[PDB]
A paper describes a structure:
aaTHEP1, the gene product of aq_1292 from Aquifex aeolicus, shows sequence homology to proteins from most thermophiles, hyperthermophiles, and higher organisms such as man, mouse, and fly. Although annotated as a nucleotide kinase, such an activity could not be confirmed for aaTHEP1 experimentally and the in vivo function of aaTHEP1 is still unknown. The crystal structure of aaTHEP1 uncovered a modified RecA-like fold.
Analysis of its nucleotide loading state using HPLC revealed that it was partially loaded with ADP (approx. 30%, data not shown). 172 amino acid residues, 249 water molecules, one phosphate, one magnesium and two sodium ions were included in the model. No electron density was found for residues D38-K43 which are part of a disordered loop. aaTHEP1 consists of a single compact domain confirming the gel filtration experiments as well as the resistance of aaTHEP1 to limited proteolysis. In contrast, as it is the case for both aaTHEP1 and the RecA superfamily, the ASCE-proteins contain an additional strand between and a catalytic essential glutamate (E107 in aaTHEP1) within the Walker B motif, thus indicating that aaTHEP1 neither belongs to the group of GTPases nor to the kinase family. No electron density for an ADP molecule was found indicating that only the nucleotide-free protein crystallized. In the nucleotide free aaTHEP1, there is also a magnesium ion at the corresponding position which is octahedrally coordinated to the hydroxyl group of T14 of the P-loop, a phosphate oxygen and four water molecules. To detect putative binding sites of aaTHEP1, we colour coded the surface of aaTHEP1 with respect to the conservation of exposed amino acids.
Numbering used by the authors: 1 to 37, 44 to 178
Write the structure that this text describes.
Amino acid sequence: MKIIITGEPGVGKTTLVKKIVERLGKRAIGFWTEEVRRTGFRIITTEGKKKIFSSKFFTSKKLVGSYGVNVQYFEELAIPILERAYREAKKDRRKVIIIDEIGKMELFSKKFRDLVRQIMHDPNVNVVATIPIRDVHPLVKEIRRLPGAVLIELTPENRDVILEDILSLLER
Ligand SMILES: [Mg+2]
Ligand code: NA
Ligand code: NA
């Protein structure tokens, strides 16, 4: 089961992912991305590891507007937790890989792109992932059109009801 959550910036995709993680408990393995307050973005894993990987203070060749992205800081936390999530999820179908966000800042990492492609196209694992509403990178387009996936456009009008639909589709 692949749940792909999309929607406008600020609509609450991370917030929803966090609710999903709490409900899933030990089933959920991966990471989400929280705003630093806005001056940047922090990766937070399901093990509570945290690091600012994109910031208005960071000098970088990898830029999204005024945010400098440190690919190495992102990878330090993202890659090992996703490699673990993928190993565990292949053996235990109760596990759900968590990836917030497959977005422009994260996609500067080749290691992340390759691992995301491997995970998303593997029929044998469950995933909850977010993508931006615009096709800001070819991998975002690829994931938006992923065959068999559940694609949810998160809005202010379904924000407070959509959780149970998602949780039912995943095993109770
Ligand atoms: Mg978010
Ligand atoms: Na959003
Ligand atoms: Na949010």
